[PDB]
RNA sequence: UGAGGCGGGGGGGCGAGGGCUCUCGCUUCUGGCGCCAAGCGCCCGGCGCCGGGCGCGACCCGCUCCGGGGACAGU
RNA sequence: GAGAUGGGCGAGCGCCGUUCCGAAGGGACGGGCGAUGGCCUCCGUUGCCCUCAGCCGAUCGAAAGGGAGUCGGGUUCAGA
């Protein structure tokens, strides 16, 4: 049933026995410059002990919780200017016949009405690229009780507003209906970042060895726990 | 003839009817098959025999 | 108050390297998975005579694991080192004269030659005509071992860095007596502007 | 506004999260070129009292120099 | 998707072609070596006319930057004749001289006469 | 060094006391040859016929390309 | 041997350096799709996708080195 002219041929990978086949190099390509720094830069942010102001960015809002508070964010999308324009050609055929509310973005606006106390609800990017600008943010919303989370991706931030990218977003007043629904996002969210707050001051972050460094102390202590556990019995 | 003048000159003026013809002399192809055939033939032998060892162990 | 012979040479442009006729850098096998897991074959091509050096050096024809190439190498002849002999290179190669395998391998007064200084540069040790290093004793943990140089001083190498078995070929070549003037004119001629010296 | 505690807090440069940011920057900066553009300023702050306008227009380049 | 070569290498882009808005200059540049500008005069010496009855061609003093592809297409165009070969060479002085030798179907005796010289 | 198989973890084979303790994952007699997959399994397209894809073969996971130094060289 | 770019240095004109701190290939084969031209036959042309690549140092450097292929006779006051 069978052709007997077909027969298989192996190949034999040993050392110089046959030539290597075309396996995936990916661990040791030379990337460019701009992937080394871009990648390395990533890594020192494990070995170095990061200081709590800064790592306090990491310990970030969980998947769920950002959905639904997107869900809520997506109704006070401020107007688009096509609407802005749609807006006052409204207001015109009245004349010749009050503002919702809605979101707030940029640490310049933020941080003023959160000094005001007139935010319910903060939000904070984790990515930011001079973090500088958001470092004080979370002890300043703690300290004038105003509840703050942190978003991952200050993109998907950028994209409630029609910008590339945000670095805050602030809730001053919503609408009577999910009034209840902001509440319990509050509670959900103050419950880790605003009474924890102590917690996270004495929280540094960093300061983990590489994969292959830590291996290795753990096999001479794993070897030294292997002749002490056969040192007394 | 010098080596840009092999353009001219047809194919059978630059080699010799025979494997590796116009590029190895007679007597060292045929040292060449019989070296790649003995190989082989060392082998088999050596590959029949470690067959052996492992009805034995 | 002007500057005196020894000092012109460090800018060179007179006093450089005849480098004209070399034949190339003569270097060990750059170090890979082969040369590390096992042994890779390699056979003696030619063996030929570079200018300003008196060791022989030798083509070495490998063939290359990854692609379907022949690399080429330029040894430092082993003296016993002939053509078509099989060199093989890596840490399971055997112990016999012209095998580069790593210093930790070989046993205590082995009696090496091109070793390399520190692991993967190549060669860079006893690797003059007629010289050569011995294994003086190893040393399992900390991977170093002990070797003697042809100038008598005892050093600490790693135990991964290799060198070739077998003393350099060309040696006894300063038994010889130059005797002419001449002679020397065409020692130096082939190395560099160094010769006639002025005291 | 925010830029008042970005400026008092880059008057820290001796703090625990400055001298982390300036070693972190010190160190990616160092891996560059002599002289290359930078997208956006480093400094926001600092490059307003300077008369940077965030606009089509201004430019920033971030340059290296020996000290000494 | 994987890397089989350990080495990384800028992939090819995209690069379009120019469109511009604009061209740079208004017009092209008119065509100063035309055919009135390469032939400038013939030449009239003892060995011109001894070049004419024997070998039976036509010597110009051409202009220096024009080709024997230029110069064989010109009188082939300003006297209707038919040209077998031109070799040129540039007269000490600096203008360039051309021995335009005519296709045996034309005798350059009587060509010689239509352009007045003889 | 053309940054080509690094560190762990699994798989098999070679042994003394069903897993643990370790070696090994295949090349040493010759101046030969060695690339651009056979094989197997699974999908898919056209008139038994013709032509494609995916995966094993070629284990898995990783955060520094491997090494060697090192808070000393060095500036 | 000279000498750009990357890079480095330099108050600066510039200098160093020539494979070194570099995303350094604008090519090729075949396949697939679309399209055109000439008897849109069949081939050429083009775009896109796929597939492949060691190239390795821009460029300059010899009228004695390397470097395919013209010889004979005749002819001028002066060129063969």
Same mark, same amino acid.
């Given at each position: 049933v069978v052709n007997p002219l077909f027969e298989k041929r192996p190949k034999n990978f040993g050392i110089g026995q046959d030539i290597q086949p075309k396996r995936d190099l990916t661990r040791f390509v030379k990337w460019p410059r701009y992937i080394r720094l871009q990648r390395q830069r990533a890594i020192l942010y494990k070995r170095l002990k990061v200081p709590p102001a800064i790592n306090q960015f990491t310990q970030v809002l969980d998947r769920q919780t950002a959905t639904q508070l997107l869900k809520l964010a997506h109704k006070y999308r401020p107007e688009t200017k096509q609407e802005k324009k749609q807006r006052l050609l409204a207001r015109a055929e009245k004349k010749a016949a009050k503002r919702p509310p809605v979101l707030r973005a940029g640490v310049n606006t933020v941080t003023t009405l959160v000094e005001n106390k007139k935010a319910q609800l903060v939000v904070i990017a984790h990515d930011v690229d001079p973090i500088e600008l958001v470092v004080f943010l979370p002890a300043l919303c703690r300290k004038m009780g105003?509840?703050?989370?942190?978003?991952? /991706?200050k993109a998907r931030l950028g994209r409630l507003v029609h910008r590339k990218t945000c670095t805050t977003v602030a809730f001053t007043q919503v609408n009577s209906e999910d009034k209840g629904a902001l509440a319990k996002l509050v509670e959900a969210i103050r419950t880790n970042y605003n009474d924890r707050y102590d917690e996270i001051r004495r929280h540094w972050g /960093?300061?983990?060895?590489g994969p292959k460094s830590v291996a290795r102390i753990a096999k001479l202590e794993k070897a030294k726990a292997?002749?002490?556990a056969t040192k007394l019995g | 003839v010098r080596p840009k003048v092999l353009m001219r000159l047809s194919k059978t003026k630059k080699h010799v009817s025979r494997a590796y =013809? =116009?590029?190895?002399?007679?007597?060292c192809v045929r040292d060449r098959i019989k070296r790649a055939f003995l190989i082989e033939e060392q082998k088999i032998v050596v590959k029949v025999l470690k067959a052996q060892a492992q009805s034995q162990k | 108050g002007r500057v005196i012979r020894g000092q012109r040479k460090g800018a060179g442009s007179v006093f450089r390297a005849h480098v004209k006729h070399r034949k190339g850098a003569a270097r060990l096998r750059a170090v890979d998975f082969a040369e590390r897991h096992g042994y890779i074959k390699g056979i003696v091509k030619d063996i030929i005579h570079d200018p300003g050096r008196g060791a *022989?050096?030798?083509?070495?024809? +490998?063939?290359? *694991?990854?692609? +379907?190439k022949k690399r080429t190498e330029l040894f430092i002849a082993a003296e016993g080192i002939h053509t078509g002999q099989f060199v093989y290179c890596g840490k399971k190669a055997q112990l016999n004269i012209g095998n580069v395998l790593p210093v930790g391998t070989m046993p205590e007064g082995t009696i090496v030659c091109c070793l390399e200084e520190k692991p993967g540069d190549r060669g860079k040790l006893a690797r003059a005509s007629g010289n050569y290093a011995t294994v003086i004793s190893h040393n399992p943990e900390t991977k170093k071992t002990r070797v003697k140089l042809p100038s008598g001083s005892k050093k600490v190498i790693s135990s991964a860095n290799r060198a070739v078995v077998g003393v350099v070929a060309g040696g006894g070549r300063i038994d010889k007596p130059i005797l002419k003037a001449g002679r020397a004119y065409h020692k130096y001629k082939a190395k560099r502007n160094c010769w006639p010296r002025v005291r | %506004?925010?830029?008042?505690?970005i400026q008092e807090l880059w008057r820290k440069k001796q703090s625990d999260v400055m001298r982390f940011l300036l070693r972190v920057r010190c160190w990616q900066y160092r891996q560059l070129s002599a002289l290359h553009?930078? @997208?956006? @300023?480093?400094? @926001?702050?600092?490059?307003?009292?300077? %008369?940077?306008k965030a606009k089509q227009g201004y430019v920033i380049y971030r340059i290296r120099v020996r000290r000494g | 998707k994987i890397?089989?070569?350990?080495?990384?290498?800028?992939?090819?882009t995209l690069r379009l072609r120019r469109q511009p808005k604009y061209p740079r200059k208004s017009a092209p540049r008119r065509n100063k070596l035309d055919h009135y500008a390469i032939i400038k005069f013939p030449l009239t010496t003892e060995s011109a006319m001894k070049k004419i009855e024997d070998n039976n061609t036509l010597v110009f003093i051409v202009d220096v930057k024009a080709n024997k592809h230029q110069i064989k297409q010109a009188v082939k165009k300003l006297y209707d004749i038919d040209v077998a070969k031109v070799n040129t060479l540039i007269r000490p002085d600096g203008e360039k001289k051309a021995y335009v030798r005519l296709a045996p179907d034309y005798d350059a005796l009587d060509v010689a006469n239509k352009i007045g010289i003889i």
């Open positions: 105003v509840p703050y989370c942190i978003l991952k /991706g /960093g300061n983990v060895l292997k002749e002490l | =013809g =116009g590029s190895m002399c007679a007597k | *022989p050096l030798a083509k070495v024809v +490998f063939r290359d *694991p990854y692609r +379907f | %506004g925010a830029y008042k505690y553009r930078a @997208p956006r @300023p480093t400094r @926001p702050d600092k490059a307003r009292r300077l %008369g940077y | 890397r089989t070569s350990p080495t990384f290498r800028r992939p090819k």
